[PDB]
Design a protein around this ligand. Sequence first.
Ligand code: CLA
Ligand code: CLA
Ligand code: CLA
Ligand code: CLA
Ligand SMILES: CC1=C[C@H](O)CC(C)(C)[C@H]1/C=C/C(C)=C/C=C/C(C)=C/C=C/C=C(C)/C=C/C=C(C)/C=C/C1=C(C)C[C@H](O)CC1(C)C
Ligand SMILES: CC1=C[C@H](O)CC(C)(C)[C@H]1/C=C/C(C)=C/C=C/C(C)=C/C=C/C=C(C)/C=C/C=C(C)/C=C/C1=C(C)C[C@H](O)CC1(C)C
Lengths: 203, 165, 192, 217
Amino acid sequence: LPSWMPGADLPGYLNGTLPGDFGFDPLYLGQDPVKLKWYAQAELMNARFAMLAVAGILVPELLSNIGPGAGVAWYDAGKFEYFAPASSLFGVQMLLFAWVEIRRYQDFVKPGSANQDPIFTNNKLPDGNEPGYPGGIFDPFGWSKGDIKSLKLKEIKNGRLAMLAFAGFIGQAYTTGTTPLKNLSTHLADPWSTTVWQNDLAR
Amino acid sequence: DIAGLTPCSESKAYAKLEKKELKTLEKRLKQYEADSAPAVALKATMERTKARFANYAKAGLLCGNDGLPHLIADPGLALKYGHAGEVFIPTFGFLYVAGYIGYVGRQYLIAVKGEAKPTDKEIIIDVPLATKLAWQGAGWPLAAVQELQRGTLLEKEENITVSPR
Amino acid sequence: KAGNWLPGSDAPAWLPDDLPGNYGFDPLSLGKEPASLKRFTESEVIHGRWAMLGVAGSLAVELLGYGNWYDAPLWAVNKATWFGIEVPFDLNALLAFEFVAMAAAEGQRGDAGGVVYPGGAFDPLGFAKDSSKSGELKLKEIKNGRLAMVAFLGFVAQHAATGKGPIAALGEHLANPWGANFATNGISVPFF
Amino acid sequence: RQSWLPGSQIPAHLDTPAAQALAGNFGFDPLGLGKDPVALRWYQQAELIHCRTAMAGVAGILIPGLLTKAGALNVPEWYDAGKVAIENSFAPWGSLLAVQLFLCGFVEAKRWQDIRKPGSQGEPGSFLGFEASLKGTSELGYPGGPFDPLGLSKEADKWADWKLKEVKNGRLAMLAFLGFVAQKYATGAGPVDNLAAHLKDPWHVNYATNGVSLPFL
Ligand code: CLA
Ligand code: CLA
Ligand code: CLA
Ligand code: CLA
Ligand SMILES: CC1=C[C@H](O)CC(C)(C)[C@H]1/C=C/C(C)=C/C=C/C(C)=C/C=C/C=C(C)/C=C/C=C(C)/C=C/C1=C(C)C[C@H](O)CC1(C)C
Ligand SMILES: CC1=C[C@H](O)CC(C)(C)[C@H]1/C=C/C(C)=C/C=C/C(C)=C/C=C/C=C(C)/C=C/C=C(C)/C=C/C1=C(C)C[C@H](O)CC1(C)C
């Protein structure tokens, strides 16, 4: 079994049943199994929103450097018109996410109870419930052939990497004051004079 | 202000008494050397006198027709006119420390009555038990009202009385 | 059972199925005891009927062009009117007649024990003389009353935010939907 | 078990089955205030009420005080908010204080009589329909029904954790408000300004340098 630090003693409540179970819990935050359920689902949610966030920060800036309505940085996305004020969009966002979020939470509380379309009562997700892993219309392209396990582990690894990447973007942008691909271009132009220690000591 | 008393910062006999005391101190001062020890002692006396008169005029004390600070002992009148720091806060400070002393003595008595030599602990003090009760007596008003509400504050009529009661 | 307020949830064991509007909605477990639940059924039906009449009144006042439900008692703070025709009274006499009439009607209603559905002279057309479609009409009645209660609280909150009537703010929402809602308001969401 | 001092002896009244299962028990009674179990019940109630209103108050200090250093919510200081609020208000402060004394007296007297008898406010007839939901939940200080809308108290395996999080955040918010008061008297600036001053120069801007807290230095 792969550990985060080979030779170290692993906690007994971490047993490989979760995707990406590497035994890393030095602060012992998940000794309670109920807290471990909540933390597994919260890890999935923070990880998937972080993956969409890092894609939404990379891909418009990766397309703005090459040959489309706006080439504006991600932290200046609020000061753009978007045919409407941001408050009305906040209201629409909170209504629709209240719907989706409360439906997902009712799946998590009672698994097997949020499956069928309430308006069109024949549309339904199958009985392979697995809270956090819906399936059905949420897997439309016919995946999960390779059984479920390796793709779950790829999902949690790309997600942890994107959570670290977004904590990146917040920190790098708060310190260097600039955009992240320009920070990568400065690290590729001269890495030996552009480290974190160089830019910290430049203050 | 209250009872026809002027404030001490406005009173003229207050300033006259301040000037008179400084005049007596400088008449005692002017018969010594400059940097000698009686001169330093009298200059420290004059410094404390000026500081004391400034502190009494600062605190909003009421002076009379003779220039002396008068105190107000009525809770509502002193809380209304800003004189609560002279009787009201001192009376609750005194009741705190006096009930402290009384409660520590009462707990020492009840602690030493349950032994084979209560009088011998009354003559020769059990110092660790006395210090333990002295530190524990800071919550004496709470413990006092709790002993009041349980009926254990009082002895019943098993007390000593005379034949006509 | 009329349905389920939240799918997957369970029906509370103190709500019977032979009762109109039983969606199983009791999170606070307020009507667990039967006398309380009887009083709340009475109160729910009465609040629903008064709210239907109040919402229909505010809609008729604003659609027929005589101000809104907020402009209507403004003459007494300053001459009454009805259908554009003056009514010769003042708030003291109106309060006297209203107090006498509501005291009499309310007292005759409260003399009865637990009567929610009187019939008789209150039902001249005899719809509930069959006891088969009567429960369906009771369910229609409790759903329309809940919708009217939600509508009237929406009227009050909507006027406390915007300062305008419901039909005028409905026209503002139909004109500029992304520029006239509870968020361009500046009150319902305190940021931005 | 866990104690406020590792090594000190736990008092005998806080080491009982009625006291060990309360919430946040660490054997901390050096004045012996909880030796009477009726007094310990009353002090449990007073601690819960001071915890909850201290958290609500300190949240009203901090979240408007943190967001006013951000963009929105131009909010005055908490030692100045009552004056600006009564300038903006519709009533004088005495009338508003009288209204809140009646409204708080009704609720507090309900809680008073529920302390004096646990099965008290569930009298039939005493309330129109709120009389059956104004009982306790078998543990006094922790009511149910309309209090706790989201039903989080129903789950039993999280319940000691919810209690202990409440008592720790509440004791910490009590220390926060007493620090707001003392910081207000010693410095004269807001608590977020005090935090910014301790972050700007920690080794020179603290309570050893304010000239108030220990004046022998
Ligand atoms: C030891 C006995 C004693 C005496 C003789 C006084 C005398 C006085 N009190 Mg004081 N007072 C006392 C103890 C006493 N006090 C105690 C123990 C308290 C705490 C409960 C107070 C709290 C208090 C307040 C809040 C006020 C007074 C006031 C007064 C003055 C007028 C009261 C009056 O007209 O009612 C007849 C006197 C009595 C019945 C004696 C008992 C006093 C009670 C406790 C308070 C009476 C207040 C009164 C109803 C308010 C009058 C308003 C004023 C503008 C006319 C008068 C000089 C008032 C004042 O400041 O006037 C300038 C005032 O507002 N007192
Ligand atoms: C106006 C008062 C009122 C009263 C007395 C009732 C009473 C009842 N309702 Mg009804 N209900 C109402 C309004 C009311 N309702 C409205 C307006 C709606 C639409 C939102 C509903 C939707 C509804 C459903 C779906 C169901 C019920 C049901 C019930 C019955 C059992 C629930 C219970 O025991 O709680 C007792 C109720 C109260 C004590 C209500 C008092 C109001 C509380 C104390 C404060 C509420 C303030 C409110 C949330 C403010 C909103 C502001 C907004 C900005 C968020 C009971 C007869 C269940 C039933 O079996 O039908 C008969 C059921 O399934 N109700
Ligand atoms: C009874 C249903 C109902 C309907 C059809 C409306 C309609 C409207 N409201 Mg009103 N409102 C309502 C209830 C309703 N409201 C309630 C219950 C409240 C108190 C919370 C309010 C408080 C309110 C404010 C403060 C404002 C409006 C405004 C508006 C207008 C703009 C759209 C909007 O932002 O809505 C408001 C959005 C919500 C209240 C959130 C949606 C939650 C609803 C109540 C759930 C039920 C809706 C249902 C699923 C679908 C509609 C049913 C209907 C067809 C019968 C629009 C005409 C705005 C305006 O004046 O525009 C110029 C405005 O500023 N409303
Ligand atoms: C609730 C916790 C708390 C926190 C985080 C702070 C933080 C601060 N205080 Mg305040 N203060 C507090 C409570 C607190 N205080 C209390 C209870 C009092 C009354 C005794 C004061 C009276 C006070 C004065 C007079 C002054 C400060 C000052 C300061 C600032 C400089 C550091 C310092 O010297 O503190 C002083 C530290 C104490 C008085 C002891 C702290 C008491 C706690 C309970 C000790 C336990 C802490 C805990 C183990 C770890 C911290 C918790 C944290 C992570 C949340 C700093 C922002 C100075 C300032 O304004 O700088 C600009 C300053 O002059 N404080
Ligand atoms: C159910 C339940 C249960 C669980 O258990 C819990 C909970 C959740 C809490 C609950 C809920 C509740 C709720 C939601 C409530 C609401 C209510 C309402 C809204 C009412 C109104 C109600 C309302 C109403 C009646 C109203 C009425 C009205 C009226 C008459 C009006 C009148 C008028 C008019 C014509 C116009 C003019 O110009 C003026 C006036 C005079 C103004
Ligand atoms: C335990 C014990 C035992 C042993 O035996 C002995 C000893 C040690 C003695 C003891 C201890 C004790 C202690 C420490 C106590 C403390 C307490 C506290 C601090 C409280 C607070 C408490 C606190 C509190 C309530 C508070 C609250 C607050 C609030 C509401 C606030 C409010 C406000 C706001 C929002 C803002 C505005 O603008 C104004 C105001 C109005 C201001």
